[PDB]
Amino acid sequence: QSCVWYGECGIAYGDKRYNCEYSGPPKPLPKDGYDLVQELCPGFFFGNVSLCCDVRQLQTLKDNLQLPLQFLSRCPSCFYNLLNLFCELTCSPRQSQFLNVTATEDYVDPVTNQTKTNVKELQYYVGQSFANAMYNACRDVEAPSSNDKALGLLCGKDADACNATNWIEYMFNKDNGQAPFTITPVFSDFPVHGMEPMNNATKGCDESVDEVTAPCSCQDCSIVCGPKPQPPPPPAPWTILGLDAMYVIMWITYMAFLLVFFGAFFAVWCYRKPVSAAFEGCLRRLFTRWGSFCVRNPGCVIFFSLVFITACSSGLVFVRVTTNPVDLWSAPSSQARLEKEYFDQHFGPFFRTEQLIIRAPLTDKHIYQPYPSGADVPFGPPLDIQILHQVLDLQIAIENITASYDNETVTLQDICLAPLSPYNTNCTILSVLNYFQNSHSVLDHKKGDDFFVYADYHTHFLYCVRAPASLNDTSLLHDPCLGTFGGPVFPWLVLGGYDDQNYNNATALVITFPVNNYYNDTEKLQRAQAWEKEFINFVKNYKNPNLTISFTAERSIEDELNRESDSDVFTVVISYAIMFLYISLALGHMKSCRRLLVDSKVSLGIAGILIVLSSVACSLGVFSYIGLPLTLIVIEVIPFLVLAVGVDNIFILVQAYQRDERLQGETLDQQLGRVLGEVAPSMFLSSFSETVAFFLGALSVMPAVHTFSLFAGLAVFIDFLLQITCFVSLLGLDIKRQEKNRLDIFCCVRASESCLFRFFKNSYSPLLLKDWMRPIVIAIFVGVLSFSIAVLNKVDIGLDQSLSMPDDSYMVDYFKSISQYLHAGPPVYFVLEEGHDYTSSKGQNMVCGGMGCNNDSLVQQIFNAAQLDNYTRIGFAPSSWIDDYFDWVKPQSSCCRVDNITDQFCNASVVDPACVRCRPLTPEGKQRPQGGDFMRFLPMFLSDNPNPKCGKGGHAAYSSAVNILLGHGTRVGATYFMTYHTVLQTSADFIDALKKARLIASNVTETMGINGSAYRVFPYSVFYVFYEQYLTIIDDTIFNLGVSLGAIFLVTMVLLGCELWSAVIMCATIAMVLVNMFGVMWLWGISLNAVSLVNLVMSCGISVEFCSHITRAFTVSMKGSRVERAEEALAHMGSSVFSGITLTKFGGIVVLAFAKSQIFQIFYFRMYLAMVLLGATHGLIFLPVLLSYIGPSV
């Protein structure tokens, strides 16, 4: 071997210097540029260099490799081969084997008068199997700020006809302007002239160069990237013979019923062609005696009852109302609640977001034409320069807002969050103007001379949507796009309306203002909300006819719902007023026109209404004393229920008395005691059946059903007691009044067979019970039940979240804008709990997405999930911190650097006095820092800032994502890897996201193989606490309804004697009522949530109020046949049940039909109408017939 040239003494032009000829042996390197030899091509570094090379040559080589390094360094396997073509060309130790100089001439030294030999020209023999493997591995490298091929900018011509041989000729040719002298390559695989070219090892875009440099991406290599992933979409519909397969199982279940049912009548119709009485008797006697007592001791009874009422209802002073949505919709110990408790403790609560979807409707899209060459690039309307200036003006004004609070000003700079503070304090604003750093200057500056612009803001936008974490454009612009706060701005968070990569086509601009959310602190939260109110007002009063903004504040949903939840109290008040008017006017039988205001029960009806309201208030007050807080579901469903039950009892009693004829020689208190002893068992059965049902239903973990059950049970019981005592005393007093000829309400001025009882008895009961009508009724009701069972499993789950808002609100527009434009959703945090090692090869492989770490690790699994992005609603990559930590610590990167004597972190921008690299640049140092080096360099990484020479640093993104536990070796605590969800528009979307995130977390926890369950991965998102209730709502409904109905069943079959048949008939009728309630749900579009569940558990209590009465009046009867017993029970009890509860609630609902609120008109008006009329029909038209048919004899 031998050399051809050494040193650089000649000069071509500018600074280009021709290498100086020397054909001696290879020089031992001067020990000066060892760093360079390990940076250019370490293939020569095995010390005893004896390199033909020169330190003045190595450092002049690197200067020419500057631009080729920037483009081709994207793909390590490419730039690797490119270097092997240069070192050997310049200073390899066997240079003479593959080189032959051609043109040289003497050079004069201005230093010694010594003529030096320059190297003017020469030819370079390169193998063909080398140039093909080189060009073929780089042809796929894409350029920055474009989708072209990187060779198009390095060939000297189009990248469409770049042969592998012409590209090498252009690089060595001085015609480009870089080569100080041109080298003529000679391509040949076989030795010619006794001279055989060089062919060193080569690597493709798929093979990795080192056990630490990951292979090339399929963006930059066509062979690495294969078949896309795909999930199997299961619909899981049965569709027996073409239709839903449930529509059919029933219609076949029904046709069978009419034939097996109508096939027995027409079959027979052609054929004809001791302990119970002991418990049912002591109750009558007890109630008779106590009724007489209460009728002859009104003063004592009423006084003690009023004292009790006051003692119980004075607890309303301690009344608390629950409005915080977390406490409302989240169980205090649910999985999501514990996860939120864990995340808020180790990482601080999730922040508050104020977004802004700006759009330019007037402007049109325009075309961008690159100067040198390239296809046209169209830009959306909002990406116009004028619209960008106006949006920058709007944002700078949004920063003004001060929003004084508590006699102090509250600026955004004060409330927002700055990741890397107090070094940099601006704060996180996520807009597309951060690419230009919120500067009109940086946005409006172009580089070029007339007739064309070299660069423009289009070029910067295109470059930075591709690489949003750069610190300089480094190509004809030299501007960073990191953002004033420090840290990348991802194009999918700041744009909307494009198509899958083309942020050029964006039609909307998103602008987020992250604000701190505080964990157990109220002064700061008040400050944030006080600033948000002024932000909302400002954005609402901004005209800018060029823009259409759809905004939101963190405090906006709560305000919109508190604004819609009123202006209908004027309707509820009229509803209750009409209910009370009817109750007051209907208790009294007329019997005469000239005797009206004397036989009137207005005062007694007022007393009954007051007793009912008193029962409500005593329940609320007792539970206020105990400490249970109220709720807006309770405050609305308790009055309805308690009024229904109380009015039913009042009418039952008053009418059972009015239709009674007094025996002779029998006094008033004895007559009333007899009437009450014969009427009280039914009211007691109903009251006990409902109380036990509700109290027993207060076992669920749903905060909406638990509190409601408690409140309603106590109210029903207290109302029963207050009635049985106070109302009987007042009934005795009013009977005295009416017998002493005293006039009605004003004062002291001196049998009935009600018109309804004469209708149910004379025209309705006989007709309904004829032999040609009972089968019709049963057929119709079984058909409706069959329909309900068929369309049952098609009921929705969840609440829309757009119907809780008024229709004239801006949140409706914001939701439309989200669904129509946004491409990202709420962020997800896959929190890896405390207990992982992180300081071992395997402990790191389980978490990596990288070179050597496993293929099923946490980061790789989240990456796959994001590759699905439709099955798994995870849209983007995990963005792990440990990969960035390793990239930072790698010696090549050379961001880490410690002080030599102090072992202190020398920044990457430092005078370089005595600071050495953290990891030695050797084969052992390349590896990951697995031992104590990991934990010795991690804190310095997390404290590093975004240095222009280093890169992004690990402070603005991971200081909060990594928890370090000082003391005891200072291990790592809990950490998270945060990604983003896909746009979630409906409750189905949110529940689907919750399910599949949980699935991914469980998969990762499985693969990690933890000893026991010491720790685990879990995802945290903001809406998880609000949507975790819909993951068990079906079984919650099942449990609640079944338990409530079984309690009703047992209580009935116990109190009513022991008749299981009567109890089972009643239970079956109430189950029918519930199934038909679900059918009406499906048919009118009511959804299954914590409001519908409360209304169903409530209806379970009015079904009883109808059935129990009708069925008990039938059971305890001594008529002859079932038909006559049924019609007698119907007349007697159903005349009071139809007039008391049915007509009252019907007037109420008909007044309530004018609600003006969607949540109300959907979940209360419709549910109440359905419940009331369904229960009325079922009881009064199906208990009669079913009992007539299969009732218990006696």
Ligand SMILES: CCCCCCCC/C=C\CCCCCCCC(=O)O[C@@H](COC(=O)CCCCCCCCCCCCCCC)COP(=O)([O-])OCC[N+](C)(C)C
């Ligand atoms: C001891 C035994 C206990 C356990 C077993 C008990 C089982 C038997 C007991 C009761 C019946 C059980 C029915 C299960 C529901 C269907 C299951 C299913 O396929 O999921 C469906 C749930 O469908 C819904 O979303 C609404 C379902 C609510 C059912 C509640 C019935 C309770 C009342 C009954 C009466 C009183 C009950 C209490 C009396 C005891 C899937 O629905 P989806 O896909 O979300 O819908 C959207 C579809 N869409 C887009 C096309 C519109």
Ligand SMILES: *[C@@H]1O[C@H](CO)[C@@H](O[C@@H]2O[C@H](CO)[C@@H](O)[C@H](O[C@H]3O[C@H](CO)[C@@H](O)[C@H](O)[C@@H]3O)[C@H]2NC(C)=O)[C@H](O)[C@H]1NC(C)=O
């Ligand atoms: C979304 O953005 C893409 C760009 O990534 C748009 O694609 C471009 O479409 C415009 C339409 O005017 C074309 O100007 C451009 O095509 C240019 O190059 C071809 C050469 O093949 C030339 O024949 C055309 O005259 C033009 O100069 C497209 N560029 C590319 C590379 O696709 C696309 O239109 C946008 N989508 C929508 C829905 O607007």
Ligand SMILES: *[C@@H]1O[C@H](CO)[C@@H](O[C@@H]2O[C@H](CO)[C@@H](O[C@H]3O[C@H](CO)[C@@H](O)[C@H](O)[C@@H]3O)[C@H](O)[C@H]2NC(C)=O)[C@H](O)[C@H]1NC(C)=O
């Ligand atoms: C990812 O998301 C969807 C899979 O669940 C699916 O969305 C696509 O885009 C829109 C969504 O509204 C729809 O496409 C429309 O236009 C096509 C013509 O190509 C019609 O055939 C459709 O009926 C529809 O009107 C589809 O819902 C769907 N099709 C596309 C892409 O247009 C995507 O296909 C999914 N893709 C992947 C790879 O995840």
Ligand SMILES: *[C@@H]1O[C@H](CO)[C@@H](O[C@H]2O[C@H](CO)[C@@H](O)[C@H](O)[C@H]2NC(C)=O)[C@H](O)[C@H]1NC(C)=O
């Ligand atoms: C955000 O903080 C940055 C520093 O991180 C500030 O930087 C700018 O300061 C001036 C504007 O007030 C500009 O004239 C400077 O050119 C710019 N800094 C540099 C690097 O030159 C900036 O003030 C803060 N906010 C804004 C609105 O930019």
Ligand SMILES: CC(C)CCC[C@@H](C)[C@H]1CC[C@H]2[C@@H]3CC=C4C[C@@H](O)CC[C@]4(C)[C@H]3CC[C@]12C
């Ligand atoms: C714009 C593009 C073409 C530039 C990329 C090609 C450049 C980097 C290539 C082509 C020719 C090469 C040069 C050829 C000759 C020498 C002299 C030697 O003693 C040091 C290396 C040096 C200085 C090379 C540096 C890299 C080089 C300049």
Ligand SMILES: *[C@@H]1O[C@H](CO)[C@@H](O)[C@H](O)[C@H]1NC(C)=O
């Ligand atoms: C270069 O790559 C192409 C792939 O398109 C292949 O067809 C060709 O055989 C390769 N030539 C080589 C490796 O010499």
Ligand SMILES: *[C@@H]1O[C@H](CO)[C@@H](O)[C@H](O)[C@H]1NC(C)=O
């Ligand atoms: C509002 O912001 C502007 C921006 O330059 C600033 O000049 C002004 O002092 C701020 N306060 C105002 C206008 O009250």
Ligand SMILES: *[C@@H]1O[C@H](CO)[C@@H](O)[C@H](O)[C@H]1NC(C)=O
């Ligand atoms: C604000 O505080 C100062 C100092 O306590 C006080 O003098 C001033 O009156 C306060 N402002 C108002 C409006 O009360």
Ligand SMILES: *[C@@H]1O[C@H](CO)[C@@H](O)[C@H](O)[C@H]1NC(C)=O
């Ligand atoms: C970005 O611009 C050039 C291009 O690479 C680079 O040399 C420079 O160091 C960078 N900017 C700064 C401020 O260092």
Ligand SMILES: *[C@@H]1O[C@H](CO)[C@@H](O)[C@H](O)[C@H]1NC(C)=O
């Ligand atoms: C709106 O656009 C017009 C036309 O570009 C411009 O003159 C005006 O300043 C913009 N802003 C307004 C009208 O507030």
Ligand SMILES: *[C@@H]1O[C@H](CO)[C@@H](O)[C@H](O)[C@H]1NC(C)=O
């Ligand atoms: C993932 O795990 C290991 C990789 O080392 C291997 O056994 C397994 O086949 C890999 N899976 C796939 C699909 O390649």
Ligand SMILES: *[C@@H]1O[C@H](CO)[C@@H](O)[C@H](O)[C@H]1NC(C)=O
């Ligand atoms: C770099 O480190 C030095 C250490 O003295 C510090 O002064 C400087 O602010 C740092 N620069 C950054 C973090 O950008």
Ligand SMILES: *[C@@H]1O[C@H](CO)[C@@H](O)[C@H](O)[C@H]1NC(C)=O
């Ligand atoms: C750094 O410290 C080591 C150990 O004392 C020493 O050998 C080395 O020469 C020092 N380097 C510099 C640049 O001072």
Ligand SMILES: *[C@@H]1O[C@H](CO)[C@@H](O)[C@H](O)[C@H]1NC(C)=O
């Ligand atoms: C968990 O892994 C199984 C098989 O390894 C896979 O079928 C399932 O889809 C994974 N869960 C996800 C991707 O959520």
